[model samples]
Target: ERPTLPIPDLLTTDARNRIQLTIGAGQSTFGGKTATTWGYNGNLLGPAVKLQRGKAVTVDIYNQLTEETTLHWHGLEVPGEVDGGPQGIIPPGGKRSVTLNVDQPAATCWFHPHQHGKTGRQVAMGLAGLVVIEDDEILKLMLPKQWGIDDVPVIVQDKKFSADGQIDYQLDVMTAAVGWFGDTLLTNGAIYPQHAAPRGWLRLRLLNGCNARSLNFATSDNRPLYVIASDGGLLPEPVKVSELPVLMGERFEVLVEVNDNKPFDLVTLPVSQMGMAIAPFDKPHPVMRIQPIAISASGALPDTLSSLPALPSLEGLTVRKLQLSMDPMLDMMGMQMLMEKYGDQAMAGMDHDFHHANKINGQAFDMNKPMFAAAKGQYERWVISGVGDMMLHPFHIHGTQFRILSENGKPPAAHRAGWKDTVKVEGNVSEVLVKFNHDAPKEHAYMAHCHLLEHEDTGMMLGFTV
Candidate 1:
């Protein structure tokens, strides 16, 4: 049962390089009946905001919801004030504006609520939208540029619903300990969605917007998925693969030839290499059905996409090692063992609150304190290792983009060959090369955390100054 695909409204910048985003609550139909949810400018998800590189853009955000919320641009490179992290909270019935220079490369980014503990529930209740930035280099490629046509953004989110079609936010101890996993899948906010595409080369900007689940992207007919871009921007060259694993808070751009006459389903197979027990209901789920129609065009794709910037030289790089896991202080025996091994640092910042169960290097999150500091404009390597049992977390960094140097001491996959802000940290270790350019003061420091929203809210996060 495939429902008609819902295309988000396209929001192009005006001559003044400005657009208005009103965060409001509304009723939206999902599994049939209408339910109350939050959105940017309309019902369900917000519009797809398009911006250009080198342009100064302004977004006026209006908060009409009942609670305080902050709109964070997931991957955009901007200053701390306008970056829209937890520090940029907007109270109900308030309005705020952000002006950014749009300095980074054009990429598939997104905007969602980042109000500390409330992020997961808000995002699950339909408060997410896409932000596509374009530059002259990409425009010259003449790829599928038509919005809602040949080029489309696919935001995949897994969710649970009540019998009345309302979003269910019920959480148990296990769910809170690991992360919330959903049974039903939604594409661009539609349940069992289907898209009709003309026979040609189509571009799909895929975003894994789920709170915790990592989507193993594949096609039903087992066709090749050409990977063209990653979290930051276009790859150096297109790489073809059978399946692409899209972790939480990550994005990818894939090119597929839609010349077949028959319909095919885009599916997310069960994750096998996550080193953890995935939910049974999280097995293979159809994202959408692609119905092809006959259409004529150049029907050609270039061997290369955009040129990638050179990687920073590791000549004088400084390396830092960190650990992510459950807070040891939660268990007396585990705390005793950790205290014996690591001494006072093991429980230095432990919090008695239940939300402080997750920690970074055994220390719970303290928004007012910066755990680390680094000199600006220096290229450094960060080795983030998972120290928990059978738990995989997608680690995300704010205020900068980085390159995955290695995963488990080996080179990263072809899909992770570009700049990224979020990397999946499985039970093994992963290293990323970063140049922290933004000035993160103690009061408004940048955040690094497990993007599993539940873990993030539970204090698997840390602030850093540059």
Candidate 2:
């Protein structure tokens, strides 16, 4: 049930730091059948947008699909207007231009549709791509820098195929209540993917693009994985571990040393969520097979990879406490039907009487009201906690990056010690320090919510202004 790994085409910037992206529908083959899907510039996932630091970039996005979609640059520290949240929508047959001043560190960001309520379907269909940012400091690491050769992008996603080998997004009320968990796994859009890797130090940019499942990544032969970077960028030092749990919308850069022409398997184990076991890869979930075809230079990885900025002082910082909880008795199916009937009005009138499936501080997302307000250029500490007894929520913030202070009253793990835009929240509370650098007015506010696609589409998100 596996196929050869397909490397995506590179989308480098022109002399003027410009790139054109066209979103349209096409047919792609998976599981031995061709199915209709959406993509950027092609049938499946789009090409990688390779960028550099200290440059101003402009992207002209054209929507050729028959519906409205917004391209959100996940983990980019851009202003709210150009952040491509739900408010920044491009209608069918419409075109818009967005400009970004690349000032953040070198990281592996990504772009996907963030249209409210419809993001899951669009991304599940195939409208997603990678963004690789590089800097002079990182290029001097003496690591694998060649694209599709030594350095590769492993976008991990799971899907459920119908009887005829086509992707099936049809859902039930229970599946929608919880997030969609696919039965089949795919890497870079290929099932049973195999890679012809060159011997020596190889870089793998691992992106957990799944809608709900969390992958426990490990090696089949029990080899150590050196994690060098996180969601926002490179870590100060690499952390070597046997297993790394990659949650939805999270990314990690790992370095592995291969010395022979033997074949090895990259695998993932099963994980637990909400006091229950989920997606147990009892048999090694053979994600990719790395068959070394030739020997190359094996460079030694450095003890220290990069230097991190000092954490902002918490003196006199604004502190906010938010809660994330859900109700099981909530009639999600009825609400979905109502929303379909009354387009905008369905958001309203969801009183406490109807069991609310998801809530932020005991209230569902209200597009009309600002959940809270903060002044621009102010540092704040947010204590985000899950109110339920079970279930894990990967809280994500738009328009700014944050530092994870503690999780469940303990310091974050080695891989999470860098700047991040998304953090996992489970059993206990998670603390993060953030500084609002961009100004978000009333009409175009930013969002903070659980990145679980189903939770987000079902009103687990809240909007804010600065």
Candidate 3:
């Protein structure tokens, strides 16, 4: 028997356009044992926040925890002041407020702690949630509109637990190299969870909330998953695929068929999209079970979904080439030193420099130095590549959404042609056209970095002004 998947509660704006968020600690029972956890406005996970485009809302964040944290609005295109980067930190018993206008298209975004150097631990401790944005164009579309019945939110994460029912936070050079991969899988905060779905078509919004591991998604019976949207919004048409590759900090919307009242599992197959592989995480595992129930279906998807604007000529735009920087010779020297100290088993406890080499463009994140300036109206082409390493990284840019120009020098697939905030880089690299519409002064800046939380914390992030 599997535990029921709990729907994330919805958050709404009050009469004065005010939204309240409180971060605190509590204990949650997982698999018949209790573990300490951190969350937003609740015990385990935060509520799914809904925002209407063009409407302005003020969010008041209160910190009840004994430690410090920052609530970053990931995938949102707002001003830097309200973007919630590491600079906007909240200390214990502290309260702060931010006012932002919801102006992006309908998309699946997320929120999590962004305090520098502590993001991996904070996010791994269950401090994450989803954000659903809506616009006038989305309001007229014929799709799954119900909150938790026909439309569902799926936040997938992997974590490790101690026999004493405690979450693990064991990190060092060796662990950070492969990124964080846990033996246990979690869906919407429950282990091996199951959900009842309508006996027709249901929209499943998938969020990769993991720290280090990449996911290769599929159905247990090899059924088709109709791709409807990417990180920014709906695609031009539905793409039928058997396997979906979603990296860290990415989101995808798919339509699942359930007309026969059968039960099946949405699973992650064995995938080693990293420099190394760890057990159980690199093996096949079921994420959630979908049990069909008799209910009204979200009608057939419209023939034509939303279309994107024509990309301007890159004739004179600046093509910014960024390297997810690393120095192989330096790393080898470090490894040799480790081997000299600990003999043959040095790889098990290799030390890392959080303020050094795991870098971006040969430098770590420096608050005093802005990488480059992007004019608010000028569009630029960013070609991101992982240099001097064998790792695959999910590069995410903040305060804007970009159009995929060429992924590894090839035109993007239909399902990947929409606006996106994060892109996976492996063999060759990826190119995208990006523009910023909001102001990011020197005090508060926008970040572009690897979504592998450990990498982001260990100097793989950079900042820029617009």
Candidate 4:
């Protein structure tokens, strides 16, 4: 029998620069038996795209699934037409190509289904991957570049397997409300897996792909991990942090030095805030592990790695705010029980529809509706308020990347200054300001929603267009 390695499975490199995407229906084996599936490159998760800045990227995405699917390029600032949410959909057996003008700095991003209501299950089953944006600007700084050596890409997720190992979209009303939590922790689609590493400076690219979970990560030895980038891009300088909290759809790039030749673990602890219960959504749990190479006397860390590019400050742009909330509930528990018995129909029976329960300026996504009316060549500011809810919902918008305005009315920290595709609204109210000048249909619209898988699947989503 194969012994469990105690490390999450790391994704192997298929090739460099070239990425092939396919949306198809098939079967996969996870825990038990084979089950139906949807994926990007193969039968499982999509491909990891390693790209150089200023280089044009062309990806031929074929939709082989039974349903319509669109791969949204999260955290990528590109032509509004290529954002790929409502404006883009891959009909079954159809194909679409995206040529990205890599005009931004080097960092980590992701691609996943932007389907309404089905995103959580589709992603949970397996349909996401990473985009490693590289550049000579940062590469010239003398950082770690050990492919399968020191630099690693970590795709984090939690899953619940069937007796047969096939992923299911079934959710009860209770689990649907609080969001779904899986039992098995998967890294790049493997059960507790491990990797061999050289004793030196390691560049770690981390992405949280869970549906409704958040991970508070730290080293087993409590070593200070230097954070170089957030969801969008880099920090002006590395921030020495012991813990990094990442929610669904969020990305973090950091560097860790192996001071000793001892095997170590990279751990992610699930909590709202360490020692502080800041929200209703933060659940305390163990997420995953990173088993480093066997301890030897040959490992060493570099003194300096990559340098971040200059961020064009959007502070000079306009600002906007959207308050998110739920309908007033007299007895939240009692109502939930009734909805379970009758399913979604129960809510409508009381002369009210069961709202997926989120509001961006008091509206949800209407596939046939428009959210914002903006002309070409315009900039805008948006503030999103969710400041008191539990679990940091990584908030994302379509069309363009923005800067996080503030959390609870105060200016954001240094890391929040760069371009962003998703922003975490901590606890109660978090605000942001964005700029866009893309030509979009005045009728057909795009969306802004909670990146938390379950939250978005249920109803924490709204729409906006330019």
Model 2 worst lDDT window (10 residues): 346-355
TM-score of each: 0.91, 0.91, 0.93, 0.82
Which is superior by lDDT, 2 or 3? 3
C-alpha lDDT values of all predictions: 0.80, 0.80, 0.83, 0.64
Residue 298, candidate 4: C-alpha displacement in angstroms: 12
RMSD of each: 6.4, 6.1, 3.5, 6.1
Q: Best candidate per TM-score, number?
A: 3
Highest lDDT: which candidate?
A: 3
Q: Write the per-residue lDDT of candidate 1 for residues 1-466, one digit (tens) a residue.
A: 5777888888986787789999999998865678898898997888988888888878999999989999988888776778777778899999999987787888999999988777888888889999898888888775777677778889998887788878888433444564665667789888878888878888899999988777788999899889889999988888999998898999999888797688998888877432122344335678899989766444346777877677788887898877887754433433343335334532222222457777898887888777989768778999999846446788898888899888765788877978899877777888999877677777667888988887788788888877
Lowest-lDDT window of 10 residues in candidate 1? 273-282
lDDT tens per residue, model 2, 160-208? 7788867788444544455766668889988868887788877899999
Q: What is the lDDT of residue 345 in candidate 2?
A: 28
What's model 2's lDDT at 6? 87
Q: Name model 3 segments beyond 4 Å from true.
A: 275-277, 329-354
Off by over 4 Å in 2: 274-280, 295-300, 331-356
Relative to the unseen true structure, what is the Cα RMSD of model 2? 6.1
Clashes of 1: 0
* Candidate 1 vs 3: which has more lDDT: 3
**Residue-by-residue lDDT tens digits, candidate 4, 1-466:** 2223322233332455445676766776666577776666677777667666777767778888877777887877666567777557778888988877776678788888877667777787788877877777666665666555566777878766667666755554544444555566677766645656656667778888877767777877788788777876666677788888777787888788764456566777546321112222233333334445544433233344445444346666565666655444412543465455445532223224433555556665566676666544555667777754544567887666666667555766665556667776756676665655454564435677877665566566765666
